[PDB]
Amino acid sequence: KFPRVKNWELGSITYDTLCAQSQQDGPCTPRRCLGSLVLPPAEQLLSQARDFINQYYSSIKRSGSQAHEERLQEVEAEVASTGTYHLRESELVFGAKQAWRNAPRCVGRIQWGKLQVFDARDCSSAQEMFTYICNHIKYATNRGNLRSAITVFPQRAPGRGDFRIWNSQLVRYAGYRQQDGSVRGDPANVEITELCIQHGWTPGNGRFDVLPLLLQAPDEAPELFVLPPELVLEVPLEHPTLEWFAALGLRWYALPAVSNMLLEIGGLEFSAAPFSGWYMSTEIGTRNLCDPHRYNILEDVAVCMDLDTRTTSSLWKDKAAVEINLAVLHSFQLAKVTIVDHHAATVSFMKHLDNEQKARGGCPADWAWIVPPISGSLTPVFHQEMVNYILSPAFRYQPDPW
Amino acid sequence: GPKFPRVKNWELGSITYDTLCAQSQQDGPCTPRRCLGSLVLPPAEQLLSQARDFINQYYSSIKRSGSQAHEERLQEVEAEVASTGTYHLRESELVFGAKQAWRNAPRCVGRIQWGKLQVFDARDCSSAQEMFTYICNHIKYATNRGNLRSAITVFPQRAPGRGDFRIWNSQLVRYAGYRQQDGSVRGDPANVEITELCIQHGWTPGNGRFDVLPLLLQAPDEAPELFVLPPELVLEVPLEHPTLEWFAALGLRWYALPAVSNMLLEIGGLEFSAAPFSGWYMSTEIGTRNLCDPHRYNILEDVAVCMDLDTRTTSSLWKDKAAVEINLAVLHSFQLAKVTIVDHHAATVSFMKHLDNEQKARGGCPADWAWIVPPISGSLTPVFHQEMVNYILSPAFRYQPDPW
Ligand code: HEM
Ligand code: HEM
Ligand SMILES: Cc1cc(N)nc(C[C@@H]2CNC[C@@H]2OCCCCCc2ccccn2)c1
Ligand SMILES: Cc1cc(N)nc(C[C@@H]2CNC[C@@H]2OCCCCCc2ccccn2)c1
Numbered sequence A: 001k002f003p004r005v006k007n008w009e010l011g012s013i014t015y016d017t018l019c020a021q022s023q024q025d026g027p028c029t030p031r032r033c034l035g036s037l038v039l040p041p042a043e044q045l046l047s048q049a050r051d052f053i054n055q056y057y058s059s060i061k062r063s064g065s066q067a068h069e070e071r072l073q074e075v076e077a078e079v080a081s082t083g084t085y086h087l088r089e090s091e092l093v094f095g096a097k098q099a100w101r102n103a104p105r106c107v108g109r110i111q112w113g114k115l116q117v118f119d120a121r122d123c124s125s126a127q128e129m130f131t132y133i134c135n136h137i138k139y140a141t142n143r144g145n146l147r148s149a150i151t152v153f154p155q156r157a158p159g160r161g162d163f164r165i166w167n168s169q170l171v172r173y174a175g176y177r178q179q180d181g182s183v184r185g186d187p188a189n190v191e192i193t194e195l196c197i198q199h200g201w202t203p204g205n206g207r208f209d210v211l212p213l214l215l216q217a218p219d220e221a222p223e224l225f226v227l228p229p230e231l232v233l234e235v236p237l238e239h240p241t242l243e244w245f246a247a248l249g250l251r252w253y254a255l256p257a258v259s260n261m262l263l264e265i266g267g268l269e270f271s272a273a274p275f276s277g278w279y280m281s282t283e284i285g286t287r288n289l290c291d292p293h294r295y296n297i298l299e300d301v302a303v304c305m306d307l308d309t310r311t312t313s314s315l316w317k318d319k320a321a322v323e324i325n326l327a328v329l330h331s332f333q334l335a336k337v338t339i340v341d342h343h344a345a346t347v348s349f350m351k352h353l354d355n356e357q358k359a360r361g362g363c364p365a366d367w368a369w370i371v372p373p374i375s376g377s378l379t380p381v382f383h384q385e386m387v388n389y390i391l392s393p394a395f396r397y398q399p400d401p402w
Numbered sequence B: 001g002p003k004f005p006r007v008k009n010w011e012l013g014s015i016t017y018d019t020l021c022a023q024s025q026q027d028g029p030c031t032p033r034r035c036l037g038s039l040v041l042p043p044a045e046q047l048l049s050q051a052r053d054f055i056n057q058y059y060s061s062i063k064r065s066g067s068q069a070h071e072e073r074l075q076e077v078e079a080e081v082a083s084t085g086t087y088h089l090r091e092s093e094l095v096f097g098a099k100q101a102w103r104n105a106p107r108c109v110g111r112i113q114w115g116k117l118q119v120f121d122a123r124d125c126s127s128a129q130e131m132f133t134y135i136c137n138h139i140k141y142a143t144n145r146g147n148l149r150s151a152i153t154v155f156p157q158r159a160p161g162r163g164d165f166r167i168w169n170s171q172l173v174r175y176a177g178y179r180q181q182d183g184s185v186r187g188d189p190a191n192v193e194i195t196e197l198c199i200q201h202g203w204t205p206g207n208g209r210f211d212v213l214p215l216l217l218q219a220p221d222e223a224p225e226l227f228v229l230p231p232e233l234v235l236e237v238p239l240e241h242p243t244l245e246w247f248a249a250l251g252l253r254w255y256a257l258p259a260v261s262n263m264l265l266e267i268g269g270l271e272f273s274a275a276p277f278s279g280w281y282m283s284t285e286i287g288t289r290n291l292c293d294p295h296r297y298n299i300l301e302d303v304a305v306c307m308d309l310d311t312r313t314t315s316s317l318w319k320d321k322a323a324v325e326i327n328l329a330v331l332h333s334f335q336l337a338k339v340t341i342v343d344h345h346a347a348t349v350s351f352m353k354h355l356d357n358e359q360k361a362r363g364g365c366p367a368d369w370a371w372i373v374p375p376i377s378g379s380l381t382p383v384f385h386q387e388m389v390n391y392i393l394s395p396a397f398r399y400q401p402d403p404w
C-alpha cells in the first residue's frame, strides 16, 4: 500500500504515507512509467473547497472550532448560489505557500514558509496588472538581496476570459529568427518575441534584449508594457582566473519569475499568479548557456580554453561546463546578488525531505528535475529514492493563450 | 493523436509514439496515484502462455510466423510441459532469447551493441568445478587481451524441487572490502558482505584496497565452493592522468571486464539463475560512481586536495573539478592500456542512434531515464533531452534474491 523509500548513500529507509492524500492522477500506469515526460460543477468544487478549508483551520490548530464551522457554511452558501466562492486573504496566503511546498519539481522548497504574497485580486486592467508586476519585481529583487514572492491576480470565472501573462517569465531575452534558419538571442523565446513584434514592439538586435510584457485582461487583446531598465537587475559574467571570459560579453538577469503557471487552491484557479525565488547556478550556467537549443556557448568557451575539441574523450564539454558554472557563481557573488550552487541547494533539499517526513509522512519529488544537470551523482539527491504525486494546492501548466 | 505514449526530444523538437509498450506483460511499480520510477528495486498454465509467446517471438524474428515449423514447435512445447511440467529451449532459441533480453533491458545504455553477443551454451554443466572452467573460458574470450567482446554464459535452468545453479558474487571481478576496527572499510565498501562470506567459506584474506575476490560458485543442492581466479586472467588497468603527474602515485586501478553474475535470465517462462554476462565499461561507471560515490572508494576529497582546490566551500565546484579529472584519468589510462572503454558522450550519442533504430524496428524502446542519463554531465549528453517510456518486456534480465 505504502512505498518504501531508501537512501542508497546512508542505507536509511522511510515509508511515504503522504501520497495516500493524492486526488489527481499522474501519467504512469502499472504497464509503463511515464515519469520522465515534461508535460501531461458544484459537487466537485465543493469537496475541494471543504478539503482545503480543513487544511487551513488544521494549519492554525483551530480545527473543529466555531470559526471553522462558520467558514465551511459561508463557502457552501456561496457555491450553492453562485457556482463559485472566494478566498479570504489569509487562506490565500496559506494556499500559495502550500502550493510551493507541494511542487514536486522544486529543489528550493526548504524556503517554502518564507514567501511574500501580494494579493492582486482587485485588478481590473492590464495597466493595473503592470503596476502590480512592477511592485513585485521591485520587492523581489531588493537590490540583489532576493526575496521570494508571488502576486496573485483575479481567479478564473465561468463567464469570461482569464487574466493572463503571456510571457513565460517576467524577464526573458528576445530570440530573433533569422532568414538563414538560426536564432539570435535566446532560442527558447522565438515565438514570444514574434508575438510582441506583432502586437507592436520595436525590436532590437542584441543577444540580451529584455522583452516587454504582454499582459491580458479578460477578453481583450493583450497589451504591451516595457519594463523600466532600472527594474531589471542583470549580472555581467566574468571568470575569476580566465580574463578572456568577460570578453565573451555574456550576462544574465537576477530574478527568476515564472509567470505562465496556474495556481489551484481549493478548486479555484488563478491563471495569472507570477512567482519568483532566486536561481540555482546550474539553471543559468548549464541549461540556459549550454543547452544546444539555447545560447549553446560550450564550443566557444572550449575553444577559448584551447581544449581539444576533435574528440569527446578529452571531456572538453565537461571541462568547459564547469568553468561556465563557476563564472556564474563568481559573477553573482561579486555583484552581491543571491544565488545558490547545486551542492548547497541539494544539501538543503535533503534537510527539507527530512523535515517533511516528520511533518507530513512524506514529500512529493520528481527525481529527474531535482537531480542537477551536471555532477548528478556528486550530489546527495542522486542517491535518494523519491516518490512523485500530485497534492493540492498546486502549480500546474496551462495552455498558451493564443 | 494515437493512444500510445507520445514521446518528445526537447533538443530536436521531434515526436514519436511508443507502440511497443502494448507488448508488455509484466507490471512495473508505478500507478496513476504515484510514480515510483526512481526506486532501484521494484508454475503450470502460466508457463505455457509465457512459452507460447516466446516461441511466436522466435518465429517472427526468423520471418516464419504461421508456418508448420512454428506450429509443430508450439505443439512440441505444449506436449513437453504437459508431461514434465517444464520444457527445454533449442540452441538458436537460447541465442535469440539472450540477445532479446539484452535488447529489452531498460537500464542499459549500451544496447546499440545488442545484436553482437557471443552466447556460450553451458546448459550441460553439472558441477561447481565445471562452472569454474566455463567462467574462465568466458573471461578469457570476453577479455581478449583488452579488445573486449560481449558474451554471456548460460548455465542449467531452474528445475522443480532440485536446487539452483548460483554464482554468489554479484560480479565476476570484485575488490575485497575489509571492515576495520575503527568502523571504516579498506577496499570496496560495496563488497563487505561477499568478502565476509568468502572468508567464512575458507578464503585466506589479504589487506589491500584492490584485492580480487575469489568466486563462490554453487551447483545444485550443494554448499558453494570457492575458486581463486588466476591473476593473468583478470586484466587490470593502473590509473594515471595525462597531465597531472602525481595522479599515478595514488595507486588507483580498475579491472577491465564488467561481468554481472547475479541476475536471473528469464526466457519463455524458463529461469536461468546463473547466466553471467559481460560487456565493456562506460567510463563514468568507474571514474564517477566506483571511485567517487561517498559510500564506495570516496576519493574526491583526496583528489581535490592534490589539485589544491578550495574544499571548504561548495561554491568552488571542487567536487565537479575533481570528478572531471578522475574521469579523464579513467579514459586516458584505458586508451593507453589498449583496453576497450566508452566515454559518456560517445555512449549516449550511440544510444540515441539505437533509439531511432528501435523506433523503426519495434515502435519504441523501454528505457529507464534515471539510469540512462550519466551521473556526471547529464544535460550535456543528448539522452537528457529525450523523454523515455519504461516498461518490462520478456525475455528479460531480472534481479533475484541472494542465495544465502
Ligand atoms: C527560493 C528560491 C528557489 C529556488 C533556489 C528554486 C529552485 C528551483 C529549481 C532549480 C527548479 C527547476 C528549474 C528548471 O530546471 O527550470 C525549480 C522549479 C520550480 N519551482 Fe522553485 N525554487 C525557488 C523558489 C520557488 C518559489 C518561490 C516557488 C513558488 C512560490 C517555486 C516553485 C517552483 C515550481 C512550481 C517549479 C516547477 C517549474 C516548472 O514546472 O516550470 N520555487 N525550483
Ligand atoms: C557492450 C558494452 C556495454 C556497455 C557500455 C553497457 C553499459 C551499461 C551501463 C553504463 C549500465 C548501468 C550500470 C550501472 O549504473 O552500474 C548498464 C546496465 C545494464 N546492462 Fe549494459 N552495457 C554493455 C553491455 C551489456 C551486455 C552484454 C549486457 C547483457 C547481455 C548488458 C545488460 C545490462 C543490464 C541487464 C543492465 C542493468 C544492470 C542492473 O540493473 O544491475 N549490457 N549497461
Ligand atoms: C508549458 C510549460 C510551462 C512551464 N512553466 N514549464 C514547463 C517546463 C519547461 C522546462 N524548461 C522550460 C520550462 O520550465 C522553466 C521553469 C523555470 C523555473 C525557474 C525558477 C523558478 C523558481 C526558482 C528558480 N528558478 C512547460
Ligand atoms: C540486487 C541488484 C542486482 C543487480 N544486478 N543490480 C542492482 C543495482 C545496483 C546499483 N548499483 C550496483 C548494482 O548494479 C550494478 C550493475 C553493474 C553494471 C555493470 C556493467 C555491465 C555491463 C556493461 C557495463 N557495466 C541490484
Ligand SMILES: C[C@H](O)[C@H](O)[C@H]1CNc2nc(N)[nH]c(=O)c2N1
Binding pocket: A036, A037, A038, A368, A369, A370, B010, B384, B385, B386, B387, B388
Ligand atoms: C526529458 C527530460 O524529462 C527533460 O529534459 C527534463 C529532465 N530533468 C530536468 N530537470 C530540471 N530541473 N529542469 C528540466 O528542464 C529538466 N528537463
Ligand SMILES: C[C@H](O)[C@H](O)[C@H]1CNc2nc(N)[nH]c(=O)c2N1
Binding pocket: A008, A382, A383, A384, A385, A386, B038, B039, B040, B370, B371, B372
Ligand atoms: C535513487 C536512484 O534511483 C539511484 O541512485 C540510481 C539513480 N541512477 C542510476 N543510474 C545508473 N546507471 N546506475 C545507478 O546505480 C543509478 N542509481
Ligand SMILES: [Zn+2]
Binding pocket: A028, A032, A033, A034, A035, B030, B034, B035, B036, B037
Ligand atoms: Zn512512473
